[PDB]
Write a protein that binds this ligand. Structure first.
Ligand SMILES: CCCCCCCCCCCCCCCCCC(=O)OC[C@H](CO[C@@H]1O[C@H](CO[C@H]2O[C@H](CO)[C@H](O)[C@H](O)[C@H]2O)[C@H](O)[C@H](O)[C@H]1O)OC(=O)CCCCCCCCCCCCCCCCC
Ligand code: CLA
Ligand code: CLA
Ligand code: CLA
Ligand code: CLA
Ligand code: CLA
Ligand code: CLA
Ligand SMILES: CCCCCCCCCCCCCCCC(=O)OC[C@H](CO[C@@H]1O[C@H](CS(=O)(=O)O)[C@@H](O)[C@H](O)[C@H]1O)OC(=O)CCCCCCCCCCCCCCC
Ligand SMILES: CC1=C(C#C/C(C)=C/C=C/C(C)=C/C=C/C=C(C)/C=C/C=C(\C)C#CC2=C(C)C[C@@H](O)CC2(C)C)C(C)(C)C[C@H](O)C1
Ligand SMILES: CC1=C(C#C/C(C)=C/C=C/C(C)=C/C=C/C=C(C)/C=C/C=C(\C)C#CC2=C(C)C[C@@H](O)CC2(C)C)C(C)(C)C[C@H](O)C1
Ligand SMILES: CCCCCCCCCCCCO[C@H]1O[C@H](CO)[C@@H](O[C@H]2O[C@H](CO)[C@@H](O)[C@H](O)[C@H]2O)[C@H](O)[C@H]1O
Lengths: 42, 171, 180, 160, 153, 180
């Protein structure tokens, strides 16, 4: 891959969007498989 | 090449000086482990298996009074279980472990090179002063044969429920 | 100029063939951006854990420790049935083992600070089997290949157990093709 | 029990469950059986019932309104309501902050720190992200070694 | 560029020592290879670890079956050491003993000279049963492949 | 090589349809210039030669065994335990059931592990051992013409391989190993 394209992908907004999309997916899937968790189960 | 396996090269760690060394190590366990540790292990197995085989045969022939009552006529590994509940196997294991503490000390002396493998200096009757190499070869050979024999006896017992001699008399 | 494993792709530049198991297999070029020392330490840890995992999944189906808690031929069921306090104890022990074996250098910034620290060498050789230069290279290659094979085998075992819902040996002896 | 009643045995909680299920069933009555809307509403009913049952068994306390209430005082019988959740937060947040600070210093000692802050060096960033898992001991080590807290005479300040 | 995960703090602008300890070549079974104080390997070497472990096992043998054994009734009877009452300690007539360190009975574990005992014994379960790789009562993977190859639409 | 240049060696093509590959250098016994796919370029020649000898020997023994089974010659007491069936597949299944084939597998594998694997490993590490050489000449038939015996063994083993395959598939089709 072009190093210039890789630097563009390393630019701040691209990384922020990708990281926050990944985090949103993480939270969404956690809530999809373990929903309605108002508490830690103990 | 190897005297035992003509087509295979002699194992590097086997010089041939040790008793019973015929270049038999096709898988090269001597190249993995220290040969002093392996020699100690082989002599140990040899002696234990010789005692075990002679014990199987002698237990078939004769049984001490009282032990028959405690084991209810059980033989071999069933006698083992019965006498574990009895507590006799516990005493044997305690004193064998007591011996094996000093056995560990002797093993590390061997690994340090001060002691020959399997040499506990036990010869009260002085039977090894004439030809120690000859006696050592005899011991190793009989021990290997006893290892194979105790294997055969124990697995025959597992197959049939009968001791060595009882099996031979009731094949 | 070309990789040995994948002929049409070029040889990975960072893989110089010094490491055991190196066939020039790095199509995605992780080695370009991640130190090969870290990658090899990770590979060896993964392969060792998966060696033990495959051995455990295969062995604890036939031999168990005494007790109803430990009596489970199915490994995923053993995960739940085994005493939870014991499992947490194992987790804590693994943490302490990581800490001490890595000598407090457990991060990407400090793991290989000591030049003596080599990838995957944690000072573990209790019986000193690796002190022989002649067999050391063969042992290293065997360890890497074993780790790779065991990783693949453990992954397959876990997912085939998810599908079949039976142990590995039990599945192979009583196979029932997947239906929905 | 503290000042309220267990939610597993509250008529208000049961009434709320009943109302939710009845709303879903009224919405379902107008859809053919087996159609995607019917399946979706049935799954909604199942999710509601599971949520209410799990809340009941969780040991949550419920007031006269019929809704679970949280006891965030320190009581160990209600740790899972605020304390353990908050410990997980603090762990994740300290991780984020520690790795971010490490990257700030890494970029500080670079040819172009501003270029490193707008166009990131994601190999080093991922390195720090990895390091962040022992941030408590690492941060305390920084503090005690004196690499964390700056001296009063080395920080710019406005005139009085 | 930077190659991440170098493991070298100086690459990442992190604190580090300046002189790193050299790595000696010495091993202790049940121990590790690494820097140690002078004489550490000699005093606490593989010999120390192994012989100490052997002593520990020999001491475990009495401990595992710990208890007051008496033949006064005519048969060997085991009674917990907790039963004994000790004078001179006020309210505490019954005092902690070895069972406090080793609560085998409380957990329902039948210890023995060797770790496991009759009641608590390793369980060997035969996986094969009566199955066979092919042409057996059990339908194996090989059986599935043969049936599939001989199948009829 | 026996009859080098006529029976085997460089410039020998048993099937002129395909050109004698340059990789086939005429140094290996049984080299008759047949390798249309050019495997000799990449394969390990000694390993593949040992594989050929092993395949041929097993095939020869298998031909003898199948012919005796179909002819109905049985050892004293074999019929009572296994049966009187002449079909090779039924005999195989019956012997597996009784335990005969299991013991043969155990001992053949023991011989492999202790003799063939070490010998092959040393030969591939450059011991100089002739492929397929185990020193098994108790009757001393090969002392006179070892090279002639070698070529005869290789060719007979190849023919036996083809014959055994044919016999098995003939038994599958007609129920007869002959297939007549
Ligand atoms: C890679 C390179 C190596 C490749 C070499 C293999 C070349 C292919 C040659 C074909 C070999 C087929 C192997 C299949 C063995 C099998 O499915 O194996 C299954 C059998 C299980 O035993 C069989 O078990 C059978 C189980 O019976 C059941 O199954 C039978 C048919 O399965 C019938 O149905 C019967 O009625 C039913 O009861 C019989 O009861 C007998 O016990 C016996 O025939 O394995 C045995 O016999 C156990 C023998 C121990 C295995 C030893 C192998 C390792 C040897 C190394 C040396 C060290 C050894 C120490
Ligand atoms: C620091 C010392 C220590 C202490 C005091 C204990 C105490 C205990 N452990 Mg252990 N444990 C320890 C270290 C320790 N552990 C470590 C370092 C590990 C990780 C390697 C474990 C891993 C572990 C597991 C996985 C389990 C225990 C369990 C137990 C309980 C055993 C009860 C019994 O009678 O067993 C008597 C039995 C034996 C002495 C047999 C020993 C068997 C091994 C394999 C040999 C007990 C609370 C069990 C438990 O919680 O049961 C409810 C359990 O499942 N522990
Ligand atoms: C605004 C004042 C205030 C504050 C600051 C706290 C603070 C605390 N309360 Mg709470 N509490 C308050 C008002 C307050 N309470 C009031 C008004 C009530 C009555 C309604 C209660 C009723 C109450 C109960 C019933 C309990 C607490 C407990 C606690 C402690 C929980 C954590 C702990 O024990 O750590 C201890 C752990 C450590 C020191 C270290 C742990 C180390 C590792 C990470 C584990 C904590 C110190 C619990 C406690 O035990 O307090 C002593 C507890 O049981 N509180
Ligand atoms: C899903 C639930 C949830 C959500 C969405 C948020 C969201 C947020 N929390 Mg969090 N928080 C939660 C649950 C949640 N919290 C719970 C349950 C607790 C109780 C433990 C807290 C306690 C908490 C604190 C104490 C703080 C936040 C802060 C924040 C905000 C900034 C966090 C940040 O920048 O992290 C990225 C991390 C950093 C920038 C590093 C520095 C800050 C972190 C929090 C330090 C952590 C370690 C430190 C040693 C803790 C000392 C705490 C002590 C002084 C009380 C953010 C809006 C921060 C805020 O509002 O600041 C104005 C903040 O300081 N939260
Ligand atoms: C797997 C094949 C097979 C099987 C099932 C048997 C089975 C048997 N053979 Mg054996 N046998 C075999 C191969 C086999 N043989 C081979 C390869 C040979 C070499 C030719 C012999 C040569 C042989 C002889 C010479 C005798 C037996 C006899 C027997 C019977 C008693 C042997 C015993 O107790 O052990 C027994 C039914 C004995 C018999 O018939 O006892 C009356 C007997 O005299 N066998
Ligand atoms: C059961 C024991 C056994 C063993 C250990 C071997 C070993 C061997 N055979 Mg085999 N062979 C056996 C039985 C056995 N054979 C039997 C019963 C027959 C029929 C009578 C044959 C017929 C035969 C032929 C015709 C040929 C071989 C060949 C080979 C060699 C190459 C295969 C290899 O290295 O795979 C090892 C595995 C790998 C390299 C990677 C794959 C890993 C797999 C998946 C795992 C292997 C599991 C292992 C075999 C199980 C037993 C373990 C146990 C001994 C501890 C090797 C020396 C070939 C050769 O080159 O000979 C010189 C060859 O041409 N064998
Ligand atoms: C008819 C085929 C045949 C031929 C021509 C040879 C030829 C040879 N074998 Mg033999 N061999 C054969 C079948 C054959 N083998 C079979 C079926 C096996 C497997 C059991 C073996 C297993 C074997 C081993 C393990 C070894 C030999 C070896 C040899 C060589 C030494 C002399 C010898 O054994 O003469 C054999 C002369 C004969 C007349 C044999 C045929 C007998 C029929 C029944 C009549 C020679 C190249 C040695 C060698 O160095 O090989 C490279 C060696 O170590 N062979
Ligand atoms: C549920 C699972 C939890 C239980 C598992 C327990 C294992 C925790 C392991 C923590 C760890 O490895 O810390 C690794 C850190 C490395 O920190 C690093 O230490 C570096 C110097 S050095 O490593 O100490 O040489 C220092 O420069 C760096 O900033 C610092 O981060 O070790 C230390 O610095 C001190 C460790 C604390 C020792 C007391 C712990 C007693 C228990
Ligand atoms: C150290 C020392 C001394 C000493 C001493 C002592 C006490 C020496 C003791 C030596 C002993 C007991 C030797 C025993 C050897 C037994 C063998 C070889 C058994 C083989 C069995 C086989 C082959 C078998 C079998 C079988 C199988 C498989 C299955 C069965 O169905 C059939 C069958 C039975 C055939 C003394 C005291 C002299 C002092 C001296 O200063 C030094
Ligand atoms: C290092 C060291 C030591 C050591 C050591 C130790 C303890 C070494 C232990 C090594 C071990 C346990 C290795 C295990 C390897 C397992 C593998 C490769 C499994 C592969 C499975 C596959 C391919 C599969 C599969 C399958 C799947 C998925 C689908 C199934 O249908 C079929 C199947 C089952 C076939 C000691 C302690 C001696 C000290 C020494 O000083 C140093
Ligand atoms: C040896 C002295 C060491 C002192 C340091 C110990 C510090 C911390 C000890 C924590 C307490 C031990 O943790 C413990 O809690 C679990 C709660 O489910 C127990 O779980 C189980 O324990 C017993 C069996 O062993 C059973 O009788 C209990 O019914 C069961 O709850 C485990 O016994 C253990 O995991």
């Amino acid at each position: 891959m072009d190093s210039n394209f890789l630097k563009y992908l390393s630019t701040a907004p691209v990384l922020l969007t990708v990281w926050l999309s990944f985090t949103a997916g993480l939270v969404i899937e956690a809530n999809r498989f373990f929903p309605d968790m108002l508490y830690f189960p103990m | 090449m190897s005297p035992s396996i003509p087509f295979l090269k002699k194992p590097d760690a086997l010089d041939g000086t040790a008793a019973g060394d015929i270049g038999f190590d096709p898988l090269g366990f001597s190249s993995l482990a220290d040969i002093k540790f392996l020699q100690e292990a082989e002599i140990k197995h040899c002696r234990i298996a010789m005692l075990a085989a002679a014990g199987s045969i002698a237990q078939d022939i004769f049984t001490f009074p009282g032990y028959s009552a405690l084991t209810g006529g059980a033989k071999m590994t069933a006698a083992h279980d019965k006498l574990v509940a009895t507590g006799t196997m516990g005493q044997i294991l305690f004193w064998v472990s007591f011996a094996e503490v000093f056995g560990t000390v002797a093993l590390f002396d061997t690994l340090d090179g001060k002691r020959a493998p399997g040499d506990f200096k036990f010869d009260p009757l002085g039977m090894g002063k004439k030809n120690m190499a000859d006696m050592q070869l005899k011991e190793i050979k009989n021990g290997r044969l006893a290892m194979l024999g105790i294997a055969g006896m124990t697995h025959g017992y597992f197959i049939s429920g009968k001791g060595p001699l009882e099996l031979l008399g009731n094949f | 100029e070309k990789s040995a494993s994948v002929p049409f792709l070029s040889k990975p530049e960072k893989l110089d063939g010094s490491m055991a198991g190196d066939v020039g297999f790095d199509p995605l070029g992780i080695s370009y951006f991640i130190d090969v020392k870290w990658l090899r330490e990770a590979e060896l840890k993964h392969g060792r854990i998966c060696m033990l995992a495959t051995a455990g999944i295969l062995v604890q189906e036939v031999i168990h420790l005494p007790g109803p808690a430990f009596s489970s031929k199915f490994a995923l069921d053993a995960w739940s049935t085994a005493p939870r306090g014991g499992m947490v104890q194992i987790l804590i022990a693994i943490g302490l083992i990581e800490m001490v074996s890595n000598r407090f250098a457990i991060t990407a910034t400090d793991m290989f600070a000591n030049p003596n620290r080599k990838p995957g060498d944690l000072g573990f050789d209790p019986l000193s089997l690796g002190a022989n230069p002649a067999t050391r290279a063969k042992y290293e290659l065997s360890e890497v290949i074993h780790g790779r094979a065991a990783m693949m085998g453990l992954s397959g075992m876990i997912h085939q157990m998810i599908v079949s819902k039976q142990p590995v040996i039990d599945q192979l002896l009583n196979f029932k093709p997947v239906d929905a | 029990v503290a000042g309220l009643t267990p939610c597993k045995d509250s008529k208000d909680f049961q009434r709320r469950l009943d109302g939710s299920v009845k709303k879903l069933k009224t919405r379902l009555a107008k859809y053919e059986k087996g159609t995607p809307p019917a399946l979706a509403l049935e799954k909604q009913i199942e999710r509601t019932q599971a949520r209410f049952e799990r809340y009941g068994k969780a040991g949550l306390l419920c007031g006269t309104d019929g809704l679970p209430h949280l006891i965030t005082d320190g009581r160990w019988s209600h740790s899972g309501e605020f304390v353990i959740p908050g410990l997980f937060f603090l762990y994740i947040a300290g991780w984020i902050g520690w790795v971010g600070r490490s990257y700030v210093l890494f970029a500080r000692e670079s040819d172009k720190p501003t270029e490193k802050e707008i166009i990131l060096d994601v190999p080093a960033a991922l390195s720090f992200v990895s390091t962040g898992f022992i941030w408590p001991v690492s941060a305390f080590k920084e503090f005690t070694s004196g690499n964390l807290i700056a001296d009063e005479s080395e920080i710019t300040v406005s005139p009085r | 560029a930077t190659v991440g995960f170098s493991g070298v703090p100086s690459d990442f602008c992190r604190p580090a020592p300046t002189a790193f300890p050299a790595e000696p070549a010495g091993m202790t079974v049940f121990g590790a290879r690494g820097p140690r104080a002078e004489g550490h390997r000699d005093k606490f070497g593989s010999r120390h670890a192994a012989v100490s472990l052997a002593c520990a096992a020999l001491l475990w043998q009495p401990i595992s079956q710990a208890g007051m054994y008496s033949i006064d009734s005519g048969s060997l009877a085991k009674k917990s050491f907790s039963e004994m009452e000790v004078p001179g300690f006020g309210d505490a007539k019954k005092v902690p003993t070895i069972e406090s360190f080793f609560p085998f009975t409380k957990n329902g574990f039948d210890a023995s000279p060797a770790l496991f005992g009759k009641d608590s014994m390793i369980v060997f379960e035969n996986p094969l049963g009566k199955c066979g790789a092919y042409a057996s009562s059990c339908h194996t993977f090989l059986d599935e492949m043969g049936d599939m190859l001989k199948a009829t639409p | 090589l026996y009859k080098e240049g006529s029976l085997q060696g460089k410039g020998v093509n048993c099937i002129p349809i395909f050109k004698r590959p340059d990789s086939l250098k005429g140094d290996a016994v049984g080299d008759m210039g047949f390798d249309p796919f050019g495997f000799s370029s990449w394969v390990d020649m000694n390993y593949v030669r040992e594989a050929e000898i092993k395949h041929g020997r097993i095939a020869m023994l298998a031909f003898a065994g199948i012919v005796v089974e179909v002819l109905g010659i049985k050892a004293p007491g074999a019929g009572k335990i296994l049966g009187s069936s002449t079909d090779i597949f039924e005999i195989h299944n019956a012997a597996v059931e009784k335990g005969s084939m299991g013991q043969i597998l155990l001992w053949c594998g023991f011989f492999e592990m202790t003799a063939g694997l070490p010998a092959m490993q040393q030969m591939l590490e450059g011991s100089g051992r002739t492929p397929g050489d185990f020193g098994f000449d108790p009757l001393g038939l090969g002392k006179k013409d070892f090279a002639q015996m070698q070529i005869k063994e290789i060719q007979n083993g190849r023919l036996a391989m083809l014959a055994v395959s044919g016999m098995v598939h003939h038994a599958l089709i007609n129920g007869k190993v002959q297939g007549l």
